[PDB]
Amino acid sequence: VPFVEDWDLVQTLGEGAYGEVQLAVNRVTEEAVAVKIVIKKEICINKMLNHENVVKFYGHRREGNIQYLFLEYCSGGELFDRIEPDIGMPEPDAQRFFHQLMAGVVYLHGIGITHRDIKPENLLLDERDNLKISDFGLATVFRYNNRERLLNKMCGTLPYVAPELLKRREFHAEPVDVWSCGIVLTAMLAGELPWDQPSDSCQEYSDWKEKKTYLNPWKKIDSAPLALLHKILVENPSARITIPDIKKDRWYNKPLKKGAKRPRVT
Ligand SMILES: O[C@H]1CC[C@H](NCc2ccc3c(c2)Cc2c-3n[nH]c2-c2ccoc2)CC1
């Protein structure tokens, strides 16, 4: 079919260190895709991925010095824009998004991949508000030939990074992603970040370790999701709850949200 390979760049979706993310529309089919205009590790990692809660990779093309990544367009935008500052969002919406975030993270850890930069800016929503993990620019392989590799590279975003990354030379990959997921859960329920970074010098972090939950952001969060956050935001990564155990948590299994409203008559 002629012109089926032609895409029009209609608008700017985002901007990173690399460059830009553009919304591309097919000339014939009008199919919408996101084009990332920038790397070798990101493409190789994206080629491994296939899951309903992970942004799809369609292919890549290099036009000299410029690399074009063809990725899934998520019309719902960023999770970040669903969080109302200092309020959050309704608890059933947060629970549904956290379930979907957990499905994506289990998938990635199962194939030996750690994202290393989970935050609401990187969590995108489709037309049906389904959460999709995006941006594998900082991602790495932590398990190969069923052998775990300890990480030492400090990366991510300080309000979301686990305390071991700042204190220890080496650390396990999986508890690091679990921690950042608990900070996302905190942001969704209180509309604010608990600390600038998880260090003893940070007063807000010291208050948390001293269980001063009568202070913000903790006082805005119900006791059931707050009991889960007490298990996730644990300083020792060896004592920190694992995802199989998050799946058995009381709040995680609490019925709260109704399914998407279907048309009906009386
Ligand atoms: O002017 C406003 C509207 C445009 C913009 N919309 C935000 C936004 C809206 C949508 C998207 C993205 C961002 C990134 C993205 C989007 N869909 N897909 C991808 C993607 C990135 C990496 O892999 C895929 C905010 C400012």
GROMACS .gro file of C-alpha atoms and ligand atoms in nm:
model
  292
    1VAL     CA    1   0.000   0.000   0.000
    2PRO     CA    2   0.163   0.336  -0.100
    3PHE     CA    3   0.242   0.603   0.171
    4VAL     CA    4   0.169   0.352   0.461
    5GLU     CA    5   0.530   0.417   0.590
    6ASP     CA    6   0.475   0.801   0.604
    7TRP     CA    7   0.419   0.960   0.948
    8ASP     CA    8   0.342   1.329   1.017
    9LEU     CA    9   0.489   1.486   1.337
   10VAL     CA   10   0.185   1.679   1.467
   11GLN     CA   11   0.287   1.790   1.827
   12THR     CA   12   0.551   1.787   2.108
   13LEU     CA   13   0.465   1.545   2.392
   14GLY     CA   14   0.778   1.580   2.604
   15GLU     CA   15   1.141   1.681   2.632
   16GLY     CA   16   1.426   1.487   2.792
   17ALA     CA   17   1.808   1.522   2.823
   18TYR     CA   18   1.826   1.349   2.484
   19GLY     CA   19   1.576   1.555   2.299
   20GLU     CA   20   1.208   1.529   2.232
   21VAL     CA   21   0.913   1.298   2.219
   22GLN     CA   22   0.680   1.382   1.928
   23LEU     CA   23   0.326   1.262   1.848
   24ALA     CA   24   0.340   1.098   1.500
   25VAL     CA   25   0.027   1.027   1.290
   26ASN     CA   26   0.024   0.784   0.993
   27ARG     CA   27  -0.063   0.945   0.654
   28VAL     CA   28  -0.282   0.649   0.543
   29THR     CA   29  -0.415   0.481   0.861
   30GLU     CA   30  -0.413   0.789   1.098
   31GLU     CA   31  -0.255   0.557   1.365
   32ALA     CA   32  -0.090   0.760   1.642
   33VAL     CA   33   0.256   0.668   1.779
   34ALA     CA   34   0.512   0.848   1.998
   35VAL     CA   35   0.849   0.911   1.831
   36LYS     CA   36   1.154   0.952   2.057
   37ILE     CA   37   1.419   1.166   1.880
   38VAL     CA   38   1.764   1.131   2.048
   39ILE     CA   39   2.066   0.491   2.349
   40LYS     CA   40   2.202   0.151   2.228
   41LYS     CA   41   2.111  -0.009   2.568
   42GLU     CA   42   1.759   0.155   2.565
   43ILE     CA   43   1.678   0.002   2.219
   44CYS     CA   44   1.816  -0.344   2.320
   45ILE     CA   45   1.615  -0.336   2.648
   46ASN     CA   46   1.298  -0.210   2.464
   47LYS     CA   47   1.330  -0.504   2.213
   48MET     CA   48   1.296  -0.753   2.508
   49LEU     CA   49   0.968  -0.596   2.641
   50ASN     CA   50   0.614  -0.726   2.583
   51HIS     CA   51   0.355  -0.653   2.856
   52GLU     CA   52   0.018  -0.468   2.887
   53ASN     CA   53   0.162  -0.233   3.163
   54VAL     CA   54   0.487  -0.150   2.972
   55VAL     CA   55   0.505   0.105   2.681
   56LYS     CA   56   0.528  -0.093   2.348
   57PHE     CA   57   0.834  -0.071   2.119
   58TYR     CA   58   0.744  -0.079   1.745
   59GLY     CA   59   1.096  -0.033   1.603
   60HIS     CA   60   1.385   0.208   1.548
   61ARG     CA   61   1.555   0.389   1.256
   62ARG     CA   62   1.881   0.589   1.248
   63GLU     CA   63   1.899   0.889   1.009
   64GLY     CA   64   2.274   0.953   1.036
   65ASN     CA   65   2.350   1.111   1.377
   66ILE     CA   66   1.976   1.106   1.480
   67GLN     CA   67   1.805   0.791   1.622
   68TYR     CA   68   1.421   0.759   1.600
   69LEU     CA   69   1.245   0.528   1.851
   70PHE     CA   70   0.885   0.434   1.755
   71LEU     CA   71   0.688   0.381   2.076
   72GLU     CA   72   0.330   0.351   2.205
   73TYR     CA   73   0.125   0.671   2.224
   74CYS     CA   74  -0.058   0.700   2.557
   75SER     CA   75  -0.343   0.958   2.510
   76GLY     CA   76  -0.416   0.979   2.888
   77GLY     CA   77  -0.078   1.148   2.940
   78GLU     CA   78   0.132   1.126   3.259
   79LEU     CA   79   0.022   0.995   3.601
   80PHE     CA   80   0.188   1.316   3.733
   81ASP     CA   81  -0.103   1.525   3.590
   82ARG     CA   82  -0.364   1.308   3.775
   83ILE     CA   83  -0.209   1.397   4.113
   84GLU     CA   84  -0.368   1.716   4.263
   85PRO     CA   85  -0.093   1.905   4.458
   86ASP     CA   86  -0.122   1.858   4.841
   87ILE     CA   87  -0.447   1.648   4.788
   88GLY     CA   88  -0.353   1.345   4.571
   89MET     CA   89  -0.638   1.154   4.404
   90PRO     CA   90  -0.931   0.929   4.517
   91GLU     CA   91  -0.798   0.619   4.705
   92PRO     CA   92  -0.970   0.369   4.461
   93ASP     CA   93  -0.791   0.535   4.160
   94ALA     CA   94  -0.453   0.519   4.345
   95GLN     CA   95  -0.514   0.148   4.431
   96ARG     CA   96  -0.601   0.059   4.067
   97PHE     CA   97  -0.287   0.247   3.940
   98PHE     CA   98  -0.068   0.079   4.208
   99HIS     CA   99  -0.205  -0.268   4.104
  100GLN     CA  100  -0.106  -0.194   3.739
  101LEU     CA  101   0.233  -0.051   3.843
  102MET     CA  102   0.295  -0.376   4.040
  103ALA     CA  103   0.200  -0.589   3.732
  104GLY     CA  104   0.454  -0.396   3.517
  105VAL     CA  105   0.734  -0.410   3.779
  106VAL     CA  106   0.679  -0.796   3.842
  107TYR     CA  107   0.707  -0.844   3.463
  108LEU     CA  108   1.033  -0.641   3.436
  109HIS     CA  109   1.193  -0.809   3.742
  110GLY     CA  110   1.083  -1.152   3.604
  111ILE     CA  111   1.292  -1.099   3.284
  112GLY     CA  112   1.584  -0.957   3.490
  113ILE     CA  113   1.530  -0.587   3.411
  114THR     CA  114   1.532  -0.297   3.665
  115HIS     CA  115   1.382   0.037   3.549
  116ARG     CA  116   1.585   0.244   3.807
  117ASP     CA  117   1.377   0.568   3.758
  118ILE     CA  118   1.011   0.494   3.855
  119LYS     CA  119   0.825   0.826   3.911
  120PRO     CA  120   0.480   0.969   3.805
  121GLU     CA  121   0.640   1.154   3.505
  122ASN     CA  122   0.744   0.808   3.363
  123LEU     CA  123   0.410   0.637   3.424
  124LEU     CA  124   0.179   0.699   3.128
  125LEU     CA  125  -0.194   0.634   3.083
  126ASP     CA  126  -0.375   0.500   2.772
  127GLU     CA  127  -0.732   0.598   2.652
  128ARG     CA  128  -0.884   0.355   2.913
  129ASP     CA  129  -0.652   0.499   3.191
  130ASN     CA  130  -0.431   0.184   3.192
  131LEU     CA  131  -0.089   0.251   3.346
  132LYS     CA  132   0.220   0.193   3.128
  133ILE     CA  133   0.583   0.206   3.249
  134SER     CA  134   0.793   0.420   3.011
  135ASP     CA  135   1.154   0.545   2.948
  136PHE     CA  136   1.413   0.263   2.966
  137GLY     CA  137   1.705   0.505   2.926
  138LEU     CA  138   1.832   0.430   3.282
  139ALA     CA  139   1.722   0.063   3.281
  140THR     CA  140   1.970  -0.225   3.312
  141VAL     CA  141   1.989  -0.608   3.327
  142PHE     CA  142   2.042  -0.727   3.687
  143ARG     CA  143   1.987  -1.103   3.628
  144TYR     CA  144   2.159  -1.297   3.349
  145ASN     CA  145   2.193  -1.676   3.305
  146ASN     CA  146   1.998  -1.696   3.639
  147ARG     CA  147   2.288  -1.509   3.813
  148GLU     CA  148   2.213  -1.189   4.001
  149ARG     CA  149   2.441  -0.890   3.955
  150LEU     CA  150   2.465  -0.636   4.239
  151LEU     CA  151   2.438  -0.273   4.129
  152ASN     CA  152   2.669   0.020   4.225
  153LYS     CA  153   2.567   0.291   3.974
  154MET     CA  154   2.386   0.580   4.145
  155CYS     CA  155   2.097   0.695   3.931
  156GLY     CA  156   1.729   0.788   3.935
  157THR     CA  157   1.568   1.097   4.098
  158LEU     CA  158   1.659   1.186   4.461
  159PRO     CA  159   1.300   1.209   4.614
  160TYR     CA  160   1.231   0.855   4.472
  161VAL     CA  161   1.569   0.686   4.535
  162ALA     CA  162   1.608   0.420   4.806
  163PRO     CA  163   1.840   0.503   5.105
  164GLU     CA  164   2.092   0.219   5.026
  165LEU     CA  165   2.188   0.394   4.693
  166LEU     CA  166   2.311   0.691   4.904
  167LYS     CA  167   2.472   0.484   5.187
  168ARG     CA  168   2.610   0.159   5.036
  169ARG     CA  169   2.865   0.085   4.764
  170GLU     CA  170   2.662  -0.218   4.636
  171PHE     CA  171   2.291  -0.300   4.651
  172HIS     CA  172   2.025  -0.540   4.515
  173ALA     CA  173   1.826  -0.398   4.218
  174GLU     CA  174   1.470  -0.515   4.311
  175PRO     CA  175   1.422  -0.344   4.658
  176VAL     CA  176   1.530  -0.015   4.488
  177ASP     CA  177   1.232  -0.029   4.242
  178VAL     CA  178   0.996  -0.138   4.531
  179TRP     CA  179   1.100   0.176   4.728
  180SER     CA  180   1.031   0.416   4.434
  181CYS     CA  181   0.684   0.248   4.396
  182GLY     CA  182   0.607   0.334   4.764
  183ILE     CA  183   0.706   0.700   4.697
  184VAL     CA  184   0.469   0.699   4.391
  185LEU     CA  185   0.194   0.556   4.623
  186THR     CA  186   0.269   0.838   4.875
  187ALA     CA  187   0.243   1.104   4.595
  188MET     CA  188  -0.095   0.959   4.473
  189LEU     CA  189  -0.251   0.961   4.824
  190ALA     CA  190  -0.114   1.290   4.965
  191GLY     CA  191  -0.025   1.493   4.653
  192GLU     CA  192   0.321   1.569   4.798
  193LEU     CA  193   0.663   1.404   4.823
  194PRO     CA  194   0.772   1.306   5.179
  195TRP     CA  195   1.141   1.423   5.158
  196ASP     CA  196   1.403   1.581   4.922
  197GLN     CA  197   1.614   1.261   4.966
  198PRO     CA  198   1.619   0.960   5.209
  199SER     CA  199   1.914   1.064   5.433
  200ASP     CA  200   1.965   1.111   5.815
  201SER     CA  201   2.049   1.483   5.745
  202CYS     CA  202   1.691   1.519   5.603
  203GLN     CA  203   1.449   1.611   5.890
  204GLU     CA  204   1.137   1.477   5.707
  205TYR     CA  205   1.313   1.141   5.659
  206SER     CA  206   1.427   1.133   6.031
  207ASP     CA  207   1.062   1.208   6.136
  208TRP     CA  208   0.941   0.908   5.927
  209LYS     CA  209   1.201   0.673   6.088
  210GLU     CA  210   1.077   0.810   6.429
  211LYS     CA  211   0.713   0.719   6.320
  212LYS     CA  212   0.581   1.081   6.347
  213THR     CA  213   0.282   0.996   6.119
  214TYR     CA  214   0.074   1.283   6.277
  215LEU     CA  215   0.279   1.508   6.042
  216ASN     CA  216   0.237   1.562   5.664
  217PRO     CA  217   0.218   1.379   5.420
  218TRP     CA  218   0.129   1.079   5.643
  219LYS     CA  219  -0.166   1.243   5.828
  220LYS     CA  220  -0.359   1.271   5.492
  221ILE     CA  221  -0.327   0.888   5.431
  222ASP     CA  222  -0.574   0.627   5.567
  223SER     CA  223  -0.438   0.365   5.815
  224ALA     CA  224  -0.474   0.067   5.569
  225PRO     CA  225  -0.257   0.219   5.280
  226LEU     CA  226  -0.031   0.379   5.550
  227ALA     CA  227   0.037   0.026   5.701
  228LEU     CA  228   0.152  -0.084   5.351
  229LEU     CA  229   0.381   0.227   5.324
  230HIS     CA  230   0.528   0.131   5.667
  231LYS     CA  231   0.638  -0.203   5.506
  232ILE     CA  232   0.769  -0.047   5.178
  233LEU     CA  233   0.956   0.257   5.311
  234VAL     CA  234   1.186   0.046   5.537
  235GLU     CA  235   1.555   0.168   5.539
  236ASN     CA  236   1.712  -0.183   5.543
  237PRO     CA  237   1.653  -0.323   5.186
  238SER     CA  238   1.680  -0.683   5.326
  239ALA     CA  239   1.384  -0.619   5.569
  240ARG     CA  240   1.182  -0.424   5.304
  241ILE     CA  241   0.868  -0.603   5.176
  242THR     CA  242   0.896  -0.787   4.840
  243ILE     CA  243   0.629  -0.760   4.566
  244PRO     CA  244   0.493  -1.123   4.630
  245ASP     CA  245   0.426  -0.999   4.989
  246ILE     CA  246   0.283  -0.660   4.870
  247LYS     CA  247   0.023  -0.879   4.682
  248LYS     CA  248  -0.092  -1.026   5.022
  249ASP     CA  249  -0.124  -0.681   5.195
  250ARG     CA  250  -0.471  -0.599   5.339
  251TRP     CA  251  -0.509  -0.261   5.157
  252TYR     CA  252  -0.371  -0.405   4.829
  253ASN     CA  253  -0.656  -0.665   4.839
  254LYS     CA  254  -0.924  -0.421   4.973
  255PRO     CA  255  -1.229  -0.385   4.739
  256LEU     CA  256  -1.261  -0.010   4.670
  257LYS     CA  257  -1.315   0.067   4.299
  258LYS     CA  258  -1.601  -0.013   4.064
  259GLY     CA  259  -1.517  -0.119   3.707
  260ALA     CA  260  -1.532   0.128   3.413
  261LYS     CA  261  -1.893   0.258   3.376
  262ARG     CA  262  -2.073   0.061   3.100
  263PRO     CA  263  -2.379   0.213   2.915
  264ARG     CA  264  -2.716   0.108   3.068
  265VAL     CA  265  -3.096   0.176   3.036
  266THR     CA  266  -3.397   0.111   3.271
  267LIG     O1  267   0.120   2.118   2.619
  267LIG     C1  268   0.092   2.005   2.702
  267LIG     C2  269   0.035   1.892   2.618
  267LIG     C3  270   0.145   1.799   2.566
  267LIG     C4  271   0.217   1.728   2.680
  267LIG     N1  272   0.161   1.593   2.700
  267LIG     C5  273   0.226   1.503   2.795
  267LIG     C6  274   0.242   1.365   2.736
  267LIG     C7  275   0.135   1.302   2.673
  267LIG     C8  276   0.151   1.180   2.609
  267LIG     C9  277   0.276   1.118   2.607
  267LIG    C10  278   0.384   1.179   2.671
  267LIG    C11  279   0.365   1.301   2.735
  267LIG    C12  280   0.508   1.096   2.654
  267LIG    C13  281   0.462   0.980   2.578
  267LIG    C14  282   0.323   0.993   2.550
  267LIG     N2  283   0.276   0.887   2.484
  267LIG     N3  284   0.383   0.804   2.468
  267LIG    C15  285   0.496   0.855   2.524
  267LIG    C16  286   0.621   0.787   2.531
  267LIG    C17  287   0.744   0.831   2.588
  267LIG    C18  288   0.829   0.729   2.583
  267LIG     O2  289   0.769   0.620   2.525
  267LIG    C19  290   0.642   0.659   2.494
  267LIG    C20  291   0.215   1.812   2.806
  267LIG    C21  292   0.218   1.961   2.774
   0.00000   0.00000   0.00000
